[PDB]
Write an enzyme that holds these catalytic residues in place. Structure first.
Site, short mmCIF file in Angstrom:
data_model
loop_
_atom_site.label_atom_id
_atom_site.label_comp_id
_atom_site.label_asym_id
_atom_site.label_seq_id
_atom_site.Cartn_x
_atom_site.Cartn_y
_atom_site.Cartn_z
N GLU A 1 0.78 -1.24 0.00
CA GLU A 1 0.00 0.00 0.00
C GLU A 1 0.82 1.29 0.00
OE1 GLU A 1 -2.47 -1.41 3.44
OE2 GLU A 1 -4.11 -1.41 1.98
N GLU B 1 -4.19 -10.49 -0.62
CA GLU B 1 -5.07 -10.40 0.54
C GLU B 1 -6.53 -10.63 0.11
OE1 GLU B 1 -2.41 -6.71 2.47
OE2 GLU B 1 -4.59 -6.75 2.68
C1 LIG Z 1 -9.49 1.09 5.85
C2 LIG Z 1 -9.65 0.15 4.65
C3 LIG Z 1 -10.51 0.85 3.59
S1 LIG Z 1 -8.02 -0.21 3.95
C4 LIG Z 1 -7.80 -1.93 4.46
O1 LIG Z 1 -7.86 -2.03 5.92
C5 LIG Z 1 -7.70 -3.41 6.37
C6 LIG Z 1 -7.80 -3.46 7.90
O2 LIG Z 1 -7.72 -4.82 8.34
C7 LIG Z 1 -6.34 -4.00 5.91
O3 LIG Z 1 -5.24 -3.30 6.52
C8 LIG Z 1 -6.27 -3.92 4.37
O4 LIG Z 1 -5.04 -4.44 3.90
C9 LIG Z 1 -6.45 -2.47 3.93
O5 LIG Z 1 -6.41 -2.38 2.51
#
Ligand SMILES: CC(C)S[C@@H]1O[C@H](CO)[C@H](O)[C@H](O)[C@H]1O
Ligand SMILES: CC(C)S[C@@H]1O[C@H](CO)[C@H](O)[C@H](O)[C@H]1O
Ligand SMILES: CC(C)S[C@@H]1O[C@H](CO)[C@H](O)[C@H](O)[C@H]1O
Ligand SMILES: [Mg+2]
Ligand SMILES: [Mg+2]
Ligand SMILES: [Mg+2]
Ligand SMILES: [Mg+2]
Ligand SMILES: [Mg+2]
Ligand code: NA
Ligand code: NA
Ligand code: NA
Ligand code: NA
Ligand code: NA
Ligand code: NA
Lengths: 1011, 211, 170
Positions: B69, B145
């Site tokens: 990210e 993921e």
């Molecule tokens: C706040 C979301 C739109 S982003 C989302 O949050 C998740 C929380 O478990 C993970 O960190 C994912 O990898 C992330 O893309």
């Protein structure tokens, strides 16, 4: 912290790189590109003090001027001021190789300046200082307070002084280090100097400013339509009222304009760039930019409020052109280029590496006048003005990052080390951020001679990603690695393969078709013009024209890197490696140019001009066919002149305007030529003339020429019979012949004509003897040194074989009195340690007309290295003003470098028959000569010759041209045959087989008489 | 990059490992503000290169990841190529910037659904079955993921596996994630309890999203 | 210099990265992957003192143990020991977004350890210290002398201590 011995620190507090700024506050001034009141030059007189190491610099210097320091001009290299010596080394680093460390004794230059700053500049906005070039590292202080640090000697380093300045007087303190970890990446083959060698200036930008902008131009299939896309970045508070207007101008006519508020499109999950905006302008039937026709538009970037209040404006010249490689060909605006290039260092004989507009313009004019259309920035980003000149005059540019680690072992030891990626990345990225808007730059280069390492691949991809509009090339590691879009070898030969382990240099023709290869091939360096060179240049161009994927190359190189020194009498002379006590050094290898340091042309320049011509010709009957090699322009300023002469005597001439479309052909029917009564060879010479002056040439400029032999009428008429008979007189030591007021004397012990009298006045100072050697050219020498001898170099082979030691041994010498003449017959053998190297058999026939016909037949041992020449030489007693000859000229020409020369009647002062190469050697030869006139003497036949006040012996024993002294009389070397000069490179034998004297038996004849 | 012992255990017990560089700039705006900035290339390069130098001899590692990210920036392309050059034995992947950029050998989206398209601007999450056949696409697809197991979840997990088995190029993915990031706290009675975001006075915080 | 607020300085005097090393002096021990006498673990009880910012760290700390410091187990996260609170945030950075600066109030953890080294190590060879994980940046001193600096909380940072060690306690 000693940041100059840490590749992890290439700068401290330095601002981001960007395209040329001026921060105009008036759009009209930005459009016209006039001076900006917001951009001040700090160039002029500064305070300078030299130190042996940074630890020797007094802390008092940071606060106030050192009374010991002197007042010098900036920009400048301090070696040029005499503080220390410039060092000339090629590959071996000038410091011990122990990265990232440098010598404890690190020459330190302390520069300082006291200047004024108006309150208005500090009241609001941002005031930055810009050092366009500091070699090689430096710390900056402003009013005693430390500002920042910077490395990379060839790109601008900027720092914000807003918080350090005061209204009124201010003082800058700059400590410049000669050596730094950056030096490990700056091992280019050139003089190693140091100091603030490029401009220094102050730039005032508003708080809300244009921090960056990129211009791109896309086209439709036939380039009849284009879209100019300009991305603009701002710094400061974002406001809904802010706007950017990009307007495009062609002269005083606005052709397109776009306005928009900030806020780029969405790029990812977190949004887009709120501080950016992209303007897109449509342009119908854009005038395209090329080296042929450098059409340019002007783009003005205005940062302003919605209501129309201008905050600031930046601008740049825009050239509409597309560069791309398709199907293995490098195309510009859809057409395959033919690179007529040359490598060019930033060098001045008096100012060192400090460039000025005058010299830059001088180079560009000379380059275009000699048919060059491209230049490579060997081997680092150039002074900013260079790109502006190339944009405007029209030259394709290869912008190269300041990265060369040649001296490492292996060459890629640093470039394949991730620890050095950061330092390398900045030299590449900051170059791109600075020059990406220049249309002249068509290719990016990752550096030079640094082998091939993973760092190159990473940076290759970085450029491909940020700027897909330009191909990326790099020669390191074999010239065809995964880090280059173009096969760009250096000194690869035309037909000969050089299978070096790991990094072979294949014949260029063979390289293109290796299994799986599809890329275009353009040599980054070829035809090493060191001294009397460029032999075989025509072979490259014939290949370039025949093979689509062979798209040219860049000659090495433009100008000799010689420096001026003065003798006890104050007279200037050209100096090279080691002439400053600098050691180790690489002597004359710093001089490889087509022009001398003062820009005077070497003879090789004309051979380059001729071969790089844009018009090709063919003759058939009475029809001349002209083919244009221009890709975009029509021949709208060309006139073809033709002349037919009989042995130099003009018989007819005419002119016809050229009307050839790019890539087109034109047929020109020559009027019937009246067959001449007289015997001799008719020659046809054509030349292309530019009636109108251009931005780069004067009216009457000759751009191309070509010659052809037409009808030949062999002489069959017998010369009038003479009513006189030469009389022979014999003695134990001589054979003398008398005829009228002329006498010839042959020494019976030496077997040579030792003297000739005209009215009892001697004509010779040295007897006429055979000569099989020549004062070695730089190409004959290669890298062979007195200590480290290269047994393979031609000079070493000749020496080891005894060619220079060999002494003539008389075998025969007889005289016979004939009906209407006296016949002298001789035979000599040249031997070394019991080995017979050469055998010379001659006959001298002196008749009643006073003419002496000399017939020479030579045998050369098949197993002795092929001799440099096969001819005769003598020192004439007289010194005449002019030299008149019927043959190839008027400039110096050799067997493998005579295509540019033309057969005609030439007449020049004696001095022009000597080429002043800084490093003396055989020079001034003229080939294909049928008649030579000097004083009362005339020689006829078919020979090569040179004539001057210097003996081959002196040239051979003198290392500098200024040490040469005219000898008594004139030395004449008349050759039946002469070896090629070579030049594909200057560190290995490069004379092609067809130009070596390997026939074993040679024959030639001469007729000597009095005009 | 994980504790060194982890790779040893994966080598010996047998688990395919995706070694990922310690690079995440999720909070930037846009997400690639730093990764597309050359000023940050040095810092980023060390996080990738030093990871490769340390773990390149572990057989368990079969794929290198440029991080997570951080949008898609030029620095990613530069480092993608660096790895390709120094270690051609392992594919390189990266999800940032759309999951199918020039910095990845594998289409590795996060939470792309099986049949439902999520046409987000610039970085859409196409149905995985549809993604494979987009004009010109030929790469394999493995979700970096998927199936966010937050609380009572994993509904529809079977839908993914049915697709994985039917489509050759859909080669699986990595569930998010293995273990709740809850921390232990004790009450007045000394009794332990599971705590999440905000339970330590930490603010702002994202509460139970750590589990 | 504030090296922790400059992305251009990610380390100072750090040794090159490499695969797992143990410097065995016996081939059979290397083959069996048994312990190596040339690889010592410094894990255990260390001295620790928490500070609200690097500027609050007393210079004396470089030369001798701070009487206010506690004895804690290492490796460890000091939030798990209660010196300050762990923070849970997903996307939004735990600090103000203003690269490359960080809060003036920068929780600083001062660790220290008094140890002895084998005699032979002081006369021949190279002795390096290895920190497999330090979150998120740190400066290193040995016997009062500055050694180096390192960043990246997830990879080992190594420094040469050959020129810093001495007989007895260090
Ligand atoms: C706040 C979301 C739109 S982003 C989302 O949050 C998740 C929380 O478990 C993970 O960190 C994912 O990898 C992330 O893309
Ligand atoms: C000396 C050769 C072995 S290397 C050779 O030397 C030349 C000297 O002008 C140039 O610098 C070439 O670019 C370089 O490759
Ligand atoms: C003799 C030409 C190559 S000079 C050439 O002609 C062009 C028009 O054809 C443009 O005027 C260019 O600016 C000019 O340099
Ligand atoms: Mg440094
Ligand atoms: Mg070199
Ligand atoms: Mg149309
Ligand atoms: Mg010709
Ligand atoms: Mg830092
Ligand atoms: Na060609
Ligand atoms: Na040279
Ligand atoms: Na014309
Ligand atoms: Na000489
Ligand atoms: Na599958
Ligand atoms: Na989470």
């Amino acid at each position: 912290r000693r940041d100059w011995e840490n590749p992890g620190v290439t700068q401290l507090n330095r601002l981001a790189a960007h395209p040329p700024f001026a921060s105009w506050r008036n759009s009209e001034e930005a459009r016209t590109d006039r001076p900006s009141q917001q951009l001040r030059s700090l160039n002029g007189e500064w305070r300078f003090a030299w130190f042996p190491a940074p630890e020797a610099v007094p802390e008092s210097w940071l606060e106030c001027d050192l009374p010991e320091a002197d007042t010098v001009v900036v920009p400048s290299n301090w070696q040029m001021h005499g503080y220390d010596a410039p060092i000339y080394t090629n590959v071996t680093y000038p410091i011990t190789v122990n990265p990232p460390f440098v010598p404890t004794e690190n020459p330190t230059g302390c520069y300082s300046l006291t200047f004024n700053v108006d309150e208005s500049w500090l009241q609001e906005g941002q005031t930055r200082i810009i050092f366009d070039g500091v070699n090689s590292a430096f710390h900056l202080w402003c009013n005693g307070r430390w500002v920042g640090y910077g490395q990379d000697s060839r790109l601008p380093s900027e720092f914000d002084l807003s918080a350090f300045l005061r209204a009124g007087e201010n003082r800058l303190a700059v400590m410049v280090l000669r050596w730094s970890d950056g030096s490990y990446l700056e091992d280019q083959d050139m003089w190693r100097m140091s100091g603030i060698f490029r401009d220094v200036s102050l730039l005032h930008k508003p708080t809300t400013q244009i921090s960056d902008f990129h211009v791109a131009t896309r086209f439709n299939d036939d380039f009849s339509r284009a879209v100019l896309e300009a991305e603009v970045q701002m710094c400061g508070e974002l406001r809904d009222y802010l706007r950017v207007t990009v307007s495009l101008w062609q002269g005083e006519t606005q052709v397109a304009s776009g306005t928009a508020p900030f806020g780029g499109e969405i790029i990812d999950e977190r949004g887009g760039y709120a501080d950016r905006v992209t303007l897109r302008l449509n342009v119908e039937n854009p005038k395209l930019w090329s080296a042929e026709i450098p059409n340019l538009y002007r783009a003005v970037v205005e940062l302003h409020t919605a209501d129309g209040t201008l905050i600031e404006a930046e601008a740049c010249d825009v050239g509409f052109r597309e560069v791309r490689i398709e199907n293995g060909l490098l195309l510009l605006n859809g057409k395959p280029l033919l690179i007529r290039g040359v490598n060019r260092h930033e060098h001045h004989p008096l100012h060192g590496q400090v460039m000025d507009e005058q010299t830059m313009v001088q180079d560009i004019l000379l380059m275009k006048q000699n048919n060059f259309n491209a230049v490579r920035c060997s081997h680092y980003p150039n002074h900013p003005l260079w790109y502006t000149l190339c944009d405007r005059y029209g030259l394709y540019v290869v912008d190269e990052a300041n990265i060369e680690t040649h001296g490492m072992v292996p060459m890629n030891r640093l470039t394949d080390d991730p620890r050095w990626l950061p330092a390398m990345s900045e030299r590449v990225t900051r170059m791109v951020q600075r020059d990406r808007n220049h249309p002249s730059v068509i290719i990016w280069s990752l550096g030079n001679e640094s082998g091939h390492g993973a760092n190159h691949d990473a940076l290759y991809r970085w450029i491909k990603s940020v700027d897909p509009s330009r191909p990326v090339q790099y020669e390191g590691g074999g010239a065809d690695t995964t880090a280059t879009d173009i096969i760009c070898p250096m000194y690869a030969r035309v037909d000969e393969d050089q299978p070096f382990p790991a990094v072979p240099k294949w014949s260029i023709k063979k390289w293109l078709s290796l299994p799986g290869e599809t890329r275009p091939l353009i040599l980054c360096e070829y035809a090493h013009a060191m001294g009397n060179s460029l032999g075989g240049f025509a072979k490259y161009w014939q290949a370039f024209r025949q093979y689509p994927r062979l798209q040219g190359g860049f000659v090495w190189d433009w100008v000799d890197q010689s420096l001026i020194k003065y003798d006890e009498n104050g007279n200037p002379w050209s100096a090279y490696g080691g002439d400053f006590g600098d050691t180790p050094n690489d002597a004359q290898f710093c001089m490889n140019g087509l022009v001398f340091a003062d820009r005077t042309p070497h003879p090789a320049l004309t051979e380059a001009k001729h071969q790089q011509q844009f018009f090709q010709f063919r003759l058939s009957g009475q029809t001349i066919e002209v083919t244009s090699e221009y890709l975009f322009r029509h021949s709208d300023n060309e006139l073809l002149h033709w002349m037919v002469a009989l042995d130099g005597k003009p018989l007819a001439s005419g002119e016809v305007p050229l009307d050839v479309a790019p890539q087109g052909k034109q047929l020109i029917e020559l009027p019937e030529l009246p067959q001449p009564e007289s015997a001799g060879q008719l020659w046809l010479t054509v030349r292309v003339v530019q009636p109108n002056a251009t931005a780069w040439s004067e009216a009457g400029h000759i751009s191309a020429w070509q010659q052809w032999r037409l009808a030949e009428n062999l002489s069959v008429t017998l010369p009038a019979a003479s009513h006189a008979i030469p009389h022979l007189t014999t003695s134990e030591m001589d054979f003398c012949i008398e005829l009228g007021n002329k006498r010839w004397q042959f020494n019976r012990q030496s077997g040579f004509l030792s003297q000739m009298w005209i009215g009892d006045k001697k004509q010779l100072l040295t007897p006429l003897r055979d000569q099989f050697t020549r004062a070695p050219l730089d190409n004959d020498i290669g890298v062979s040194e007195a200590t480290r001898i290269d047994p393979n170099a031609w000079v070493e082979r000749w020496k080891a074989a005894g060619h220079y030691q060999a002494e003539a041994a008389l075998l025969q010498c007889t005289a016979d009195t004939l009906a209407d003449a006296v016949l002298i017959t001789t035979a000599h053998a040249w031997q070394h340690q019991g080995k017979t190297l050469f055998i010379s058999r001659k006959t001298y026939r002196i008749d009643g007309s006073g003419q002496m016909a000399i017939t020479v037949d030579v045998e050369v041992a098949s197993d002795t290295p092929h001799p440099a020449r096969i001819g005769l030489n003598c020192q004439l007693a007289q010194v005449a003003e002019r030299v008149n000859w019927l043959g190839l000229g008027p400039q110096e020409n050799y067997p493998d470098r005579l295509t540019a020369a033309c057969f005609d009647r030439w007449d020049l002062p004696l001095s022009d028959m000597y080429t002043p190469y800084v490093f003396p050697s055989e020079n001034g030869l003229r080939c294909g000569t049928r008649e030579l006139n000097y004083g009362p003497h005339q020689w006829r036949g078919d020979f090569q010759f040179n004539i001057s006040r210097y003996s081959q012996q002196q040239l051979m024993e003198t290392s500098h041209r200024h040490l040469l002294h005219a000898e008594e009389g004139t030395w004449l070397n008349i050759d039946g045959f002469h070896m090629g000069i070579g030049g594909d490179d200057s560190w290995s034998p490069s004379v092609s087989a067809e130009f070596q004297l390997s026939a074993g038996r040679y024959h030639y004849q001469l007729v000597w008489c009095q005009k």
